[PDB]
Amino acid sequence: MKLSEYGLQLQEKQKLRHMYGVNERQFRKTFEEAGKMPGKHGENFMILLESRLDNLVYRLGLARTRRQARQLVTHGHILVDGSRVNIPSYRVKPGQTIAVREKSRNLQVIKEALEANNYIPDYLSFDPEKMEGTYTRLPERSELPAEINEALIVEFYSR
């Protein structure tokens, strides 16, 4: 009857998993992949989940939801650092700029998400005139879901 902690640990993973829509492969992969940058492995995982090409797009205001942002990337409309990145699993890093493709600017789905913008993180600079977002810095926990805890998920790979 009383669920032990072993169940609460994976439970947390279930949430952070169906959160921004992180597939399992991208979850385990993005994981052993985050252990590359130094700075609390957990933090890294919480930093890549947002770096997701789709996340950043939706985070700014070019799409209303992942169904809208994800579709934008695939449409090779987002120009990273001035380069078409129709790859959603790709990853962006400081110094790179997210910019909507010209022909892909009258997109109603975007013109509609531009208004839905009313809260852009501090490390993301959104340019409305040229519709260009810039990764001016890395994200922090003061903005990522706080009701989440990767620890119980950290030792999970040590099992």
N, CA and C atoms as an extended XYZ file, in Angstrom:
477
Properties=species:S:1:pos:R:3:atomname:S:1:resname:S:1:resid:I:1 pbc="F F F"
N         0.867       -1.213        0.000 N   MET     1
C         0.000        0.000        0.000 CA  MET     1
C         0.892        1.248        0.000 C   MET     1
N         1.780        1.356        0.951 N   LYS     2
C         2.675        2.545        1.003 CA  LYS     2
C         3.765        2.412       -0.062 C   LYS     2
N         3.692        3.196       -1.102 N   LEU     3
C         4.724        3.113       -2.173 CA  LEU     3
C         6.086        3.511       -1.594 C   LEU     3
N         7.114        2.770       -1.906 N   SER     4
C         8.464        3.107       -1.375 CA  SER     4
C         9.051        4.273       -2.172 C   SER     4
N        10.235        4.702       -1.831 N   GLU     5
C        10.860        5.835       -2.569 CA  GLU     5
C        11.273        5.368       -3.966 C   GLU     5
N        11.686        4.138       -4.088 N   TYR     6
C        12.107        3.616       -5.420 CA  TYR     6
C        11.055        3.976       -6.473 C   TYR     6
N         9.804        3.973       -6.102 N   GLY     7
C         8.735        4.309       -7.085 CA  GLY     7
C         8.670        5.825       -7.284 C   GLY     7
N         8.892        6.583       -6.245 N   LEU     8
C         8.836        8.066       -6.382 CA  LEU     8
C         9.976        8.547       -7.280 C   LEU     8
N        11.112        7.910       -7.215 N   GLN     9
C        12.251        8.341       -8.073 CA  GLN     9
C        11.834        8.262       -9.543 C   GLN     9
N        11.556        7.082      -10.028 N   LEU    10
C        11.153        6.938      -11.456 CA  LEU    10
C         9.909        7.795      -11.719 C   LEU    10
N         9.025        7.904      -10.766 N   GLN    11
C         7.816        8.747      -10.983 CA  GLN    11
C         8.272       10.123      -11.473 C   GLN    11
N         9.202       10.715      -10.775 N   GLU    12
C         9.714       12.049      -11.190 CA  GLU    12
C        10.176       11.980      -12.648 C   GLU    12
N        10.861       10.929      -13.018 N   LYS    13
C        11.332       10.805      -14.428 CA  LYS    13
C        10.122       10.806      -15.364 C   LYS    13
N         9.065       10.146      -14.977 N   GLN    14
C         7.851       10.102      -15.841 CA  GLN    14
C         7.378       11.526      -16.138 C   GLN    14
N         7.397       12.383      -15.157 N   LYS    15
C         6.943       13.785      -15.388 CA  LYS    15
C         7.939       14.499      -16.307 C   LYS    15
N         9.132       14.724      -15.830 N   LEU    16
C        10.150       15.426      -16.659 CA  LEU    16
C        10.206       14.795      -18.053 C   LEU    16
N         9.667       13.616      -18.206 N   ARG    17
C         9.686       12.954      -19.543 CA  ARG    17
C         8.538       13.500      -20.396 C   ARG    17
N         7.329       13.411      -19.911 N   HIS    18
C         6.169       13.924      -20.694 CA  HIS    18
C         6.059       15.440      -20.509 C   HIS    18
N         7.078       16.054      -19.975 N   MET    19
C         7.037       17.529      -19.766 CA  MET    19
C         7.091       18.243      -21.118 C   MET    19
N         8.268       18.563      -21.583 N   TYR    20
C         8.390       19.257      -22.895 CA  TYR    20
C         8.286       18.229      -24.021 C   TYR    20
N         7.980       17.003      -23.690 N   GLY    21
C         7.864       15.951      -24.740 CA  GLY    21
C         9.256       15.429      -25.096 C   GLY    21
N         9.973       14.911      -24.130 N   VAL    22
C        11.345       14.377      -24.403 CA  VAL    22
C        11.243       12.865      -24.638 C   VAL    22
N        11.382       12.431      -25.858 N   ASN    23
C        11.288       10.971      -26.136 CA  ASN    23
C        12.277       10.218      -25.246 C   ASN    23
N        12.082        8.938      -25.072 N   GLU    24
C        13.014        8.153      -24.216 CA  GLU    24
C        14.417        8.198      -24.821 C   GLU    24
N        14.542        7.867      -26.077 N   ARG    25
C        15.884        7.896      -26.723 CA  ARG    25
C        16.536        9.254      -26.461 C   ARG    25
N        15.820       10.320      -26.692 N   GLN    26
C        16.396       11.673      -26.452 CA  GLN    26
C        16.658       11.852      -24.955 C   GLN    26
N        15.886       11.203      -24.127 N   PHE    27
C        16.089       11.330      -22.655 CA  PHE    27
C        17.402       10.640      -22.269 C   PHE    27
N        17.492        9.355      -22.491 N   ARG    28
C        18.738        8.617      -22.136 CA  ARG    28
C        19.917        9.166      -22.943 C   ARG    28
N        19.716        9.432      -24.205 N   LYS    29
C        20.831        9.969      -25.033 CA  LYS    29
C        21.245       11.336      -24.488 C   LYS    29
N        20.358       12.292      -24.532 N   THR    30
C        20.692       13.648      -24.014 CA  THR    30
C        21.323       13.524      -22.621 C   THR    30
N        21.081       12.434      -21.938 N   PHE    31
C        21.664       12.260      -20.574 CA  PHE    31
C        23.162       11.958      -20.684 C   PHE    31
N        23.516       10.750      -21.034 N   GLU    32
C        24.964       10.405      -21.155 CA  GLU    32
C        25.672       11.472      -21.993 C   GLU    32
N        24.917       12.296      -22.666 N   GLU    33
C        25.522       13.367      -23.508 CA  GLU    33
C        25.753       14.615      -22.647 C   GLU    33
N        24.938       14.815      -21.647 N   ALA    34
C        25.107       16.014      -20.777 CA  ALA    34
C        26.268       15.782      -19.801 C   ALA    34
N        26.600       14.549      -19.538 N   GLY    35
C        27.723       14.267      -18.599 CA  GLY    35
C        29.035       14.747      -19.220 C   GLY    35
N        28.962       15.388      -20.357 N   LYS    36
C        30.203       15.883      -21.023 CA  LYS    36
C        30.558       17.270      -20.481 C   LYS    36
N        29.591       18.141      -20.366 N   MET    37
C        29.883       19.508      -19.851 CA  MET    37
C        30.034       19.459      -18.319 C   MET    37
N        31.044       20.096      -17.766 N   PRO    38
C        31.267       20.113      -16.290 CA  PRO    38
C        30.317       21.086      -15.580 C   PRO    38
N        29.670       20.648      -14.530 N   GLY    39
C        28.733       21.550      -13.790 CA  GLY    39
C        27.512       20.754      -13.325 C   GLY    39
N        27.685       19.885      -12.366 N   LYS    40
C        26.535       19.082      -11.863 CA  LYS    40
C        25.826       18.395      -13.035 C   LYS    40
N        26.064       17.125      -13.219 N   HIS    41
C        25.404       16.388      -14.337 CA  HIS    41
C        23.912       16.731      -14.369 C   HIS    41
N        23.246       16.619      -13.251 N   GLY    42
C        21.789       16.936      -13.214 CA  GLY    42
C        21.526       18.265      -13.925 C   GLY    42
N        22.160       19.320      -13.490 N   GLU    43
C        21.942       20.643      -14.142 CA  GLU    43
C        22.064       20.493      -15.661 C   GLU    43
N        23.145       19.928      -16.126 N   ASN    44
C        23.327       19.753      -17.596 CA  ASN    44
C        22.046       19.168      -18.208 C   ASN    44
N        21.594       18.044      -17.724 N   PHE    45
C        20.349       17.444      -18.289 CA  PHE    45
C        19.228       18.486      -18.262 C   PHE    45
N        19.116       19.221      -17.190 N   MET    46
C        18.050       20.260      -17.098 CA  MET    46
C        18.391       21.423      -18.036 C   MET    46
N        19.587       21.445      -18.564 N   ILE    47
C        19.990       22.556      -19.482 CA  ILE    47
C        19.776       22.124      -20.941 C   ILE    47
N        19.976       20.868      -21.251 N   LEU    48
C        19.772       20.416      -22.660 CA  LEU    48
C        18.273       20.326      -22.956 C   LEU    48
N        17.500       19.821      -22.031 N   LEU    49
C        16.030       19.708      -22.267 CA  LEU    49
C        15.495       21.033      -22.821 C   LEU    49
N        16.041       22.135      -22.383 N   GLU    50
C        15.559       23.459      -22.878 CA  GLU    50
C        16.279       23.817      -24.180 C   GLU    50
N        17.528       23.459      -24.298 N   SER    51
C        18.281       23.786      -25.543 CA  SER    51
C        17.583       23.150      -26.748 C   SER    51
N        16.736       22.180      -26.515 N   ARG    52
C        16.028       21.506      -27.646 CA  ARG    52
C        15.544       22.544      -28.664 C   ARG    52
N        15.913       22.368      -29.904 N   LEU    53
C        15.501       23.330      -30.968 CA  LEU    53
C        14.025       23.712      -30.800 C   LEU    53
N        13.159       22.749      -30.653 N   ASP    54
C        11.711       23.075      -30.504 CA  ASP    54
C        11.481       23.890      -29.230 C   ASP    54
N        11.984       23.434      -28.115 N   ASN    55
C        11.783       24.187      -26.843 CA  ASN    55
C        12.081       25.673      -27.070 C   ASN    55
N        13.316       26.005      -27.339 N   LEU    56
C        13.694       27.425      -27.565 CA  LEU    56
C        12.638       28.134      -28.428 C   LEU    56
N        12.323       27.606      -29.578 N   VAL    57
C        11.306       28.270      -30.442 CA  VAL    57
C        10.039       28.543      -29.626 C   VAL    57
N         9.410       27.519      -29.119 N   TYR    58
C         8.169       27.734      -28.323 CA  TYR    58
C         8.470       28.678      -27.154 C   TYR    58
N         9.567       28.477      -26.476 N   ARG    59
C         9.901       29.365      -25.325 CA  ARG    59
C         9.766       30.827      -25.759 C   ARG    59
N        10.426       31.206      -26.822 N   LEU    60
C        10.324       32.616      -27.293 CA  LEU    60
C         8.849       32.941      -27.565 C   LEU    60
N         8.442       32.977      -28.808 N   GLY    61
C         7.011       33.285      -29.111 CA  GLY    61
C         6.744       33.098      -30.608 C   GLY    61
N         7.441       32.191      -31.239 N   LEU    62
C         7.233       31.954      -32.700 CA  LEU    62
C         6.175       30.867      -32.902 C   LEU    62
N         5.794       30.185      -31.857 N   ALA    63
C         4.756       29.119      -32.000 CA  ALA    63
C         3.954       29.036      -30.699 C   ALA    63
N         2.725       28.622      -30.791 N   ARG    64
C         1.868       28.540      -29.580 CA  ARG    64
C         2.242       27.327      -28.728 C   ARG    64
N         2.511       26.206      -29.339 N   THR    65
C         2.844       24.988      -28.542 CA  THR    65
C         3.857       24.122      -29.294 C   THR    65
N         4.353       23.095      -28.655 N   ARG    66
C         5.344       22.205      -29.319 CA  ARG    66
C         4.812       21.783      -30.689 C   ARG    66
N         3.553       21.452      -30.771 N   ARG    67
C         2.982       21.038      -32.083 CA  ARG    67
C         3.236       22.147      -33.103 C   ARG    67
N         3.315       23.368      -32.647 N   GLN    68
C         3.564       24.510      -33.573 CA  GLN    68
C         5.072       24.743      -33.704 C   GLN    68
N         5.790       24.739      -32.616 N   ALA    69
C         7.262       24.961      -32.706 CA  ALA    69
C         7.924       23.777      -33.424 C   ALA    69
N         7.694       22.581      -32.965 N   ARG    70
C         8.320       21.400      -33.627 CA  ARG    70
C         8.094       21.477      -35.141 C   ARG    70
N         6.884       21.736      -35.554 N   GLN    71
C         6.588       21.813      -37.014 CA  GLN    71
C         7.416       22.924      -37.669 C   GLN    71
N         7.668       24.000      -36.972 N   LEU    72
C         8.475       25.096      -37.585 CA  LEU    72
C         9.876       24.568      -37.895 C   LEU    72
N        10.529       23.988      -36.925 N   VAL    73
C        11.896       23.450      -37.171 CA  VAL    73
C        11.866       22.552      -38.409 C   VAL    73
N        11.178       21.445      -38.321 N   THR    74
C        11.098       20.499      -39.467 CA  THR    74
C        10.913       21.261      -40.783 C   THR    74
N        10.139       22.308      -40.774 N   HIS    75
C         9.931       23.084      -42.030 CA  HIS    75
C        11.217       23.839      -42.382 C   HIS    75
N        12.309       23.492      -41.751 N   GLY    76
C        13.605       24.174      -42.045 CA  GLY    76
C        13.394       25.687      -42.146 C   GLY    76
N        12.698       26.265      -41.201 N   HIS    77
C        12.448       27.741      -41.231 CA  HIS    77
C        13.360       28.434      -40.217 C   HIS    77
N        13.700       27.760      -39.157 N   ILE    78
C        14.580       28.379      -38.126 CA  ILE    78
C        16.031       28.387      -38.634 C   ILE    78
N        16.614       29.556      -38.727 N   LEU    79
C        18.026       29.676      -39.195 CA  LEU    79
C        18.943       29.817      -37.982 C   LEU    79
N        19.570       28.758      -37.557 N   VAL    80
C        20.481       28.870      -36.386 CA  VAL    80
C        21.793       29.509      -36.853 C   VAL    80
N        22.303       30.453      -36.105 N   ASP    81
C        23.574       31.126      -36.506 CA  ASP    81
C        23.511       31.472      -37.998 C   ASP    81
N        22.326       31.536      -38.544 N   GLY    82
C        22.182       31.850      -39.993 CA  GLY    82
C        22.305       30.554      -40.796 C   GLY    82
N        21.720       29.488      -40.310 N   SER    83
C        21.804       28.185      -41.036 CA  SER    83
C        20.519       27.386      -40.810 C   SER    83
N        19.952       26.868      -41.861 N   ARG    84
C        18.700       26.074      -41.729 CA  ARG    84
C        18.970       24.822      -40.888 C   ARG    84
N        18.245       24.649      -39.808 N   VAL    85
C        18.438       23.445      -38.932 CA  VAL    85
C        17.096       22.722      -38.795 C   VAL    85
N        16.675       22.045      -39.829 N   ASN    86
C        15.380       21.312      -39.764 CA  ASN    86
C        15.542       20.100      -38.850 C   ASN    86
N        16.639       20.031      -38.144 N   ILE    87
C        16.878       18.883      -37.225 CA  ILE    87
C        16.394       19.269      -35.811 C   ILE    87
N        15.403       18.593      -35.259 N   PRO    88
C        14.880       18.929      -33.901 CA  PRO    88
C        15.770       18.381      -32.773 C   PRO    88
N        16.460       17.299      -33.012 N   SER    89
C        17.331       16.719      -31.948 CA  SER    89
C        18.655       17.488      -31.876 C   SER    89
N        18.922       18.328      -32.836 N   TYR    90
C        20.200       19.095      -32.813 CA  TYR    90
C        20.292       19.855      -31.489 C   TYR    90
N        21.356       20.586      -31.275 N   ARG    91
C        21.500       21.344      -29.995 CA  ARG    91
C        22.187       22.680      -30.267 C   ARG    91
N        21.703       23.731      -29.660 N   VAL    92
C        22.300       25.085      -29.876 CA  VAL    92
C        23.165       25.466      -28.672 C   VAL    92
N        24.097       26.366      -28.863 N   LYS    93
C        24.986       26.795      -27.737 CA  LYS    93
C        25.220       28.311      -27.839 C   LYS    93
N        25.490       28.976      -26.735 N   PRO    94
C        25.733       30.446      -26.727 CA  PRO    94
C        26.483       30.926      -27.975 C   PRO    94
N        26.210       32.126      -28.418 N   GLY    95
C        26.899       32.657      -29.633 CA  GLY    95
C        26.075       32.316      -30.876 C   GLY    95
N        25.131       31.419      -30.746 N   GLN    96
C        24.284       31.033      -31.916 CA  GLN    96
C        22.979       31.832      -31.883 C   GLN    96
N        22.490       32.245      -33.030 N   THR    97
C        21.219       33.038      -33.082 CA  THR    97
C        20.101       32.216      -33.721 C   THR    97
N        18.939       32.247      -33.128 N   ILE    98
C        17.765       31.529      -33.708 CA  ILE    98
C        17.011       32.552      -34.554 C   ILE    98
N        16.846       32.324      -35.836 N   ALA    99
C        16.139       33.345      -36.679 CA  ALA    99
C        15.151       32.684      -37.640 C   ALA    99
N        13.947       33.197      -37.681 N   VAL   100
C        12.916       32.623      -38.587 CA  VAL   100
C        13.341       32.836      -40.041 C   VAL   100
N        13.094       31.877      -40.891 N   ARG   101
C        13.484       32.033      -42.319 CA  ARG   101
C        12.613       33.124      -42.952 C   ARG   101
N        13.176       33.921      -43.817 N   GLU   102
C        12.388       35.015      -44.459 CA  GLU   102
C        11.034       34.490      -44.951 C   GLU   102
N        11.020       33.817      -46.071 N   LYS   103
C         9.735       33.292      -46.630 CA  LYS   103
C         8.866       32.692      -45.520 C   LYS   103
N         9.461       32.279      -44.433 N   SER   104
C         8.669       31.674      -43.316 CA  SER   104
C         8.410       32.726      -42.232 C   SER   104
N         7.962       33.901      -42.610 N   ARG   105
C         7.688       34.979      -41.600 CA  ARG   105
C         6.199       35.339      -41.616 C   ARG   105
N         5.553       35.230      -42.744 N   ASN   106
C         4.106       35.570      -42.802 CA  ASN   106
C         3.306       34.394      -42.250 C   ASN   106
N         3.983       33.344      -41.881 N   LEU   107
C         3.284       32.154      -41.328 CA  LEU   107
C         2.266       32.588      -40.274 C   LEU   107
N         1.005       32.383      -40.530 N   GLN   108
C        -0.024       32.780      -39.532 CA  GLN   108
C         0.330       32.165      -38.178 C   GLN   108
N         0.676       30.909      -38.167 N   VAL   109
C         1.029       30.236      -36.885 CA  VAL   109
C         2.104       31.046      -36.142 C   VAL   109
N         2.974       31.729      -36.843 N   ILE   110
C         4.001       32.547      -36.136 CA  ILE   110
C         3.385       33.897      -35.796 C   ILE   110
N         2.942       34.604      -36.801 N   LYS   111
C         2.302       35.931      -36.573 CA  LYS   111
C         1.306       35.808      -35.425 C   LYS   111
N         0.793       34.626      -35.227 N   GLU   112
C        -0.184       34.402      -34.128 CA  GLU   112
C         0.565       34.159      -32.814 C   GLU   112
N         1.691       33.491      -32.863 N   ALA   113
C         2.448       33.229      -31.603 CA  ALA   113
C         3.224       34.485      -31.177 C   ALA   113
N         3.517       35.382      -32.088 N   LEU   114
C         4.263       36.610      -31.693 CA  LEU   114
C         3.474       37.354      -30.613 C   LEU   114
N         2.172       37.345      -30.703 N   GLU   115
C         1.351       38.056      -29.683 CA  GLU   115
C         1.307       37.232      -28.399 C   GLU   115
N         1.264       35.935      -28.522 N   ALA   116
C         1.215       35.071      -27.312 CA  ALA   116
C         2.503       35.241      -26.503 C   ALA   116
N         3.371       36.121      -26.926 N   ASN   117
C         4.646       36.334      -26.182 CA  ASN   117
C         4.418       37.335      -25.049 C   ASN   117
N         4.698       36.945      -23.834 N   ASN   118
C         4.502       37.876      -22.684 CA  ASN   118
C         5.384       37.432      -21.519 C   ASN   118
N         6.460       36.761      -21.819 N   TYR   119
C         7.386       36.289      -20.749 CA  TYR   119
C         8.569       35.567      -21.401 C   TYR   119
N         9.610       36.285      -21.740 N   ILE   120
C        10.803       35.644      -22.375 CA  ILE   120
C        11.945       35.565      -21.344 C   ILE   120
N        12.536       34.406      -21.122 N   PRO   121
C        13.653       34.264      -20.144 CA  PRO   121
C        14.658       35.422      -20.228 C   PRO   121
N        15.592       35.477      -19.317 N   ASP   122
C        16.595       36.582      -19.334 CA  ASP   122
C        17.782       36.213      -20.229 C   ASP   122
N        18.058       34.946      -20.403 N   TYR   123
C        19.218       34.551      -21.260 CA  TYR   123
C        18.799       34.510      -22.737 C   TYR   123
N        17.541       34.752      -23.026 N   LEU   124
C        17.065       34.744      -24.450 CA  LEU   124
C        16.682       36.164      -24.867 C   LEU   124
N        17.287       36.661      -25.916 N   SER   125
C        16.954       38.029      -26.417 CA  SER   125
C        16.056       37.867      -27.646 C   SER   125
N        14.847       38.372      -27.601 N   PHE   126
C        13.919       38.216      -28.768 CA  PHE   126
C        13.872       39.495      -29.605 C   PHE   126
N        14.169       39.386      -30.876 N   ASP   127
C        14.124       40.576      -31.781 CA  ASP   127
C        12.838       40.488      -32.627 C   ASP   127
N        11.871       41.355      -32.412 N   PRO   128
C        10.589       41.313      -33.175 CA  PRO   128
C        10.704       41.951      -34.565 C   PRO   128
N        11.448       43.014      -34.689 N   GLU   129
C        11.583       43.675      -36.017 CA  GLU   129
C        12.089       42.666      -37.049 C   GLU   129
N        13.196       42.025      -36.776 N   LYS   130
C        13.757       41.034      -37.742 CA  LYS   130
C        13.340       39.616      -37.335 C   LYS   130
N        12.474       39.486      -36.366 N   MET   131
C        12.043       38.124      -35.934 CA  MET   131
C        13.286       37.249      -35.730 C   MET   131
N        14.164       37.651      -34.839 N   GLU   132
C        15.401       36.854      -34.585 CA  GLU   132
C        15.656       36.732      -33.083 C   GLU   132
N        15.829       35.522      -32.615 N   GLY   133
C        16.104       35.291      -31.165 CA  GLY   133
C        17.597       35.023      -31.002 C   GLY   133
N        18.185       35.430      -29.901 N   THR   134
C        19.655       35.211      -29.703 CA  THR   134
C        19.932       34.526      -28.369 C   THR   134
N        20.724       33.486      -28.394 N   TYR   135
C        21.086       32.795      -27.126 CA  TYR   135
C        22.211       33.628      -26.496 C   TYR   135
N        21.868       34.607      -25.701 N   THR   136
C        22.920       35.495      -25.116 CA  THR   136
C        23.556       34.856      -23.873 C   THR   136
N        22.998       33.795      -23.359 N   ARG   137
C        23.610       33.166      -22.150 CA  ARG   137
C        22.970       31.802      -21.882 C   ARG   137
N        23.483       31.070      -20.926 N   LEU   138
C        22.911       29.726      -20.611 CA  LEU   138
C        21.749       29.893      -19.616 C   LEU   138
N        20.833       28.951      -19.573 N   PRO   139
C        19.664       29.009      -18.643 CA  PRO   139
C        20.039       28.609      -17.208 C   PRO   139
N        19.151       28.835      -16.271 N   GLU   140
C        19.433       28.466      -14.846 CA  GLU   140
C        18.177       27.834      -14.235 C   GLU   140
N        18.264       27.385      -13.015 N   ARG   141
C        17.084       26.741      -12.368 CA  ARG   141
C        16.022       27.791      -12.027 C   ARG   141
N        16.426       28.990      -11.710 N   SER   142
C        15.433       30.045      -11.355 CA  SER   142
C        14.398       30.213      -12.473 C   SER   142
N        14.514       29.461      -13.542 N   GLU   143
C        13.534       29.581      -14.671 CA  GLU   143
C        13.042       28.189      -15.076 C   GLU   143
N        13.834       27.174      -14.856 N   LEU   144
C        13.401       25.795      -15.230 CA  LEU   144
C        12.514       25.225      -14.113 C   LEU   144
N        11.577       24.362      -14.439 N   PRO   145
C        10.673       23.745      -13.429 CA  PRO   145
C        11.382       23.459      -12.099 C   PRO   145
N        10.915       24.045      -11.030 N   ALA   146
C        11.557       23.813       -9.701 CA  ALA   146
C        10.925       22.590       -9.035 C   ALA   146
N         9.693       22.302       -9.351 N   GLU   147
C         9.017       21.127       -8.734 CA  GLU   147
C         9.626       19.835       -9.290 C   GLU   147
N        10.755       19.932       -9.950 N   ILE   148
C        11.418       18.717      -10.521 CA  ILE   148
C        12.695       18.422       -9.734 C   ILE   148
N        13.125       17.187       -9.729 N   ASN   149
C        14.364       16.817       -8.985 CA  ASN   149
C        15.070       15.679       -9.735 C   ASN   149
N        16.205       15.959      -10.319 N   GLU   150
C        16.931       14.918      -11.109 CA  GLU   150
C        17.738       13.974      -10.203 C   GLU   150
N        17.993       14.347       -8.981 N   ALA   151
C        18.790       13.445       -8.093 CA  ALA   151
C        18.232       12.016       -8.155 C   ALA   151
N        17.041       11.804       -7.667 N   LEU   152
C        16.441       10.434       -7.712 CA  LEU   152
C        16.656        9.830       -9.108 C   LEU   152
N        16.794       10.666      -10.105 N   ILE   153
C        17.022       10.158      -11.493 CA  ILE   153
C        18.532       10.059      -11.750 C   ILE   153
N        19.326       10.742      -10.966 N   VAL   154
C        20.805       10.683      -11.159 CA  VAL   154
C        21.298        9.270      -10.824 C   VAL   154
N        21.224        8.891       -9.578 N   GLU   155
C        21.699        7.535       -9.176 CA  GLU   155
C        20.956        6.454       -9.969 C   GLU   155
N        19.922        6.812      -10.681 N   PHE   156
C        19.175        5.779      -11.457 CA  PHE   156
C        20.117        5.105      -12.456 C   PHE   156
N        21.017        5.849      -13.036 N   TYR   157
C        21.956        5.250      -14.018 CA  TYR   157
C        23.071        4.512      -13.274 C   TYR   157
N        23.250        4.803      -12.014 N   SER   158
C        24.321        4.118      -11.236 CA  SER   158
C        23.850        2.716      -10.843 C   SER   158
N        22.583        2.443      -10.993 N   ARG   159
C        22.064        1.094      -10.628 CA  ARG   159
C        22.527        0.070      -11.666 C   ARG   159
